[PDB]
């Protein structure tokens, strides 16, 4: 039972929950690989049994009637058909647990407040798009954001697979050049190549919201132009730097990830887009200041008249902080839900204590919980963490080509 | 072999050096514990044999007459005495390799430029003090800091260890109190109590330099005061916030870690203090802003007239950025060597490139290498790393009391 210390307070806990990890991680006694982003058939019944046992443990209903009975029909369902279908409430319980189990998510204090949209009966790129469009509008909610996941049908052998080709529902274009360099988002130049290579008319500028590439089983993808009224965006202004607005920066309201594979009780949902709301460093620090993203940091420091000739003026740090101030200020002025990294990390420490008494620990990936600016100014920095894989979970999956 | 990606640039390498990992860390395939701070002649023979092979590789004499002679010699001396002695050149090479191998050190671009003082003939605590004073004097060098290590006699059967009880050669007292609060550095309350109970007359300032507690084999520790003019200090001021000088903040020039164990070819040196020069975030962010250290952040933000009643104003990030500016400016004004986190991490990237060519990899602990502020603004943030233990090495050891 791994001993875990908080160095700011001096408190000690034990992660007894780690003793129940499934999928082995990338680390061995000889070398740690925790900093790696992507680490490198009756098996279905073992994972199905275990997920059902989880479900009835939570609702105080282990070791009695419906517990016994629910065990049998999945046995028979797999005996007869080879796969199985989840009860709607089990799908709800599995989705919240996969969120609860995400080691890299700092927002998990919210894990119990999740809206599960069941799309398991879907069957075309036209049905997808409507299900996706109801999500975005419910999730956006005029800027009062609400966490939501939409679950498309559970993959089965012999036939294709529902998949969304974009990494997220809202992405910005990335256009090449005579010189390779990109107008717009460099992280999306590739999926921008597939949209133009499928009928889409390439726009001009930096913040062109890409269309969707939606794929029903076996049939090729189909473009879908998102409605401008459905894609809520926030223009970026600074409370006291009047020229910041003139830089023409924007970001969208809804982070909705659409390339991860939801896995519950041995079943795989390659299309299950989930969404919440942004922590501000995600936008201001990574999306806008990463050298391989919008890379705006030097442009903002010039406007602030900072001395960029020597790193020791800390001009990168000063301009970064102001970009984050502008993100927080702009989202709040537009009445769009956002959380700063101080509030978010303090809530995550509260989640750690909750999960300690409820489950005896919590899988947390230190390198992703600590924010990308001002790390040691937040409490999670001084908190040791244990990382491991619990089920149900969100997994990465290959790109569909 | 582990594949390692840099995400800023897209490059990819394989850490083949990790396969030679001479010991075992705390991670298993079940669970990663990378974020934890604190993770027989036959075996002395094989450790020694491997170090000797390393030494003769570095001087391009592998498998030679002189190489096999030294193996037979070492084996003979372990049989006759249970231990063996390093040649002077072997000691210098082993001390540099220990620095080179240290996974949490961002300063390793410098590893070949290290001054090795051989104090293995030291006989008492009094001589030990003289060796240490000369180390401080050489390393400080009137502000033009030089990297050095002094190595005291190795652990040997029959006699006790040389130990320095202080965790660094220069530290500020931390005086307990009631109302419960610490005056001075709270990290040093325990050593401060030990000094008092060994006959030190305590001051009552916030930056009182502690005496040295030095243990000769099979002797109680002996108190030694450092001559005030040996301990170079830097009063902290800010280039534009003139009230900052009125805080009365100071820090010392020389970071000299004295409580670690140096291991070379199976031999152990429990007393071998080493020093380099500061990276400004260790002082500004950690030593001054950690809530459990000097904890000046809120007092600085109030003075800056920042809005401290809400976190989304990012008052903490703005105050910490100015504390770091003050540190860098104060040290440059005083002509005392200092490196900012941007230059340091950029030189660490060159070290990784050098090391990949030389040894096929480099042990690095991502969470220690990424600075405590402005993490993703530095290039080490976007570099994946492999953490593992090579020997020779600096190891932690328990406190002598
Ligand atoms: C409600 C507010 C939420 C906040 C503030 C939040 C915040 C974050 C942040 C900051 C990250 C890492 C940033 C990065 O990877 O660059 C992350 C990752 C993640 N989040 Fe959350 N999140 C929220 C809701 C959710 C929801 C609703 C789900 C799913 C139902 C979820 C599941 C995940 C997962 C699986 C990851 C891992 C990403 C990966 O491994 O690539 N989160 N979240
Ligand atoms: C010359 C300039 C140097 C710089 C800029 C530097 C930088 C650093 C920094 C920033 C840390 C981590 C501090 C923290 O924990 O917050 C560190 C750790 C460390 N340094 Fe360096 N260092 C230097 C010289 C040296 C030398 C000369 C040695 C040994 C001969 C050394 C050995 C180590 C070791 C062993 C650690 C790990 C400490 C631990 O594991 O607890 N360093 N270094
Ligand atoms: C629900 C939710 C809310 C939120 N606020 N942020 C989220 C961020 C991700 C995310 C997913 C994958 C991923 C990365 C971030 C980052 N790295 C930079 C590269 C690609 O991998 C996923 C879900 C989020
Ligand atoms: C030679 C050298 C130069 C330099 N500039 N810094 C150094 C820092 C350390 C260090 C050693 C141990 C350690 C910590 C830092 C940090 N944490 C805060 C708690 C205790 O563990 C050791 C040697 C350094
Ligand atoms: C190499 C390193 O693991 C990689 O850059 C990680 C670090 N921590 C992160 N943390 C978050 N939240 N998102 C990321 O993309 C990363 N990237
Ligand atoms: C718990 C956490 O791992 C711990 O506070 C670490 C994080 N990274 C660090 N990195 C450095 N350089 N120094 C430190 O003291 C720490 N502390
Ligand atoms: Cl994003
Ligand atoms: Cl220090
Ligand atoms: Gd101007
Ligand atoms: Gd001023
Ligand atoms: Zn690990």
Numbering used by the authors:
A (entry chain A): 68 to 107, 120 to 480
B (entry chain B): 68 to 106, 119 to 480
Publication excerpt:
We first observed protein backbone structural changes with compound 3, followed by observations of the same structural changes in nNOS with many other inhibitors (12 cases in hnNOS and four cases in rnNOS, unpublished results). Compound 4 is a typical example, as shown in Figure 8, where the inhibitor can bind both to the active site and to the BH4 site in hnNOS, triggering backbone changes, but only one inhibitor binds to the active site in heNOS and does not induce backbone changes. However, the crystal structure of heNOS P370N bound with 4 revealed that the inhibitor still binds only at the active site while BH4 is undisturbed, just as in the wild-type heNOS-4 complex. One inhibitor molecule is in the active site, as expected, but the second can displace the BH4 cofactor in nNOS but is much less likely to do so in eNOS. The bulkier His371 in heNOS makes extensive contact with Trp74 and His461 in the neighboring subunit, while Ser607 in hnNOS has no contact at the dimer interface. It appears more likely that the tighter dimer interface in eNOS makes it more difficult to displace BH4 since BH4 sits at the dimer interface and is likely important for stabilizing the dimer.
Nitric oxide (NO) is an important signaling molecule critical in the cardiovascular, neuronal, and immune systems. The enzyme responsible for generating NO is nitric oxide synthase (NOS), a P450-like heme thiolate enzyme that oxidizes l-arginine to NO and L-citrulline. Humans and other mammals express three different NOS isoforms: endothelial NOS (eNOS), neuronal NOS (nNOS), and inducible NOS (iNOS). nNOS is an important therapeutic target since the overproduction of NO by nNOS in the brain is associated with a number of neurodegenerative diseases. Thus, nNOS is an attractive target for therapeutic intervention. In our efforts to develop inhibitors selective for neuronal nitric oxide synthase (nNOS) over endothelial nitric oxide synthase (eNOS), we found that nNOS can undergo conformational changes in response to inhibitor binding that does not readily occur in eNOS. Here, we used a combination of crystallography, mutagenesis, and computational methods to better understand the structural basis for these differences in NOS inhibitor binding.
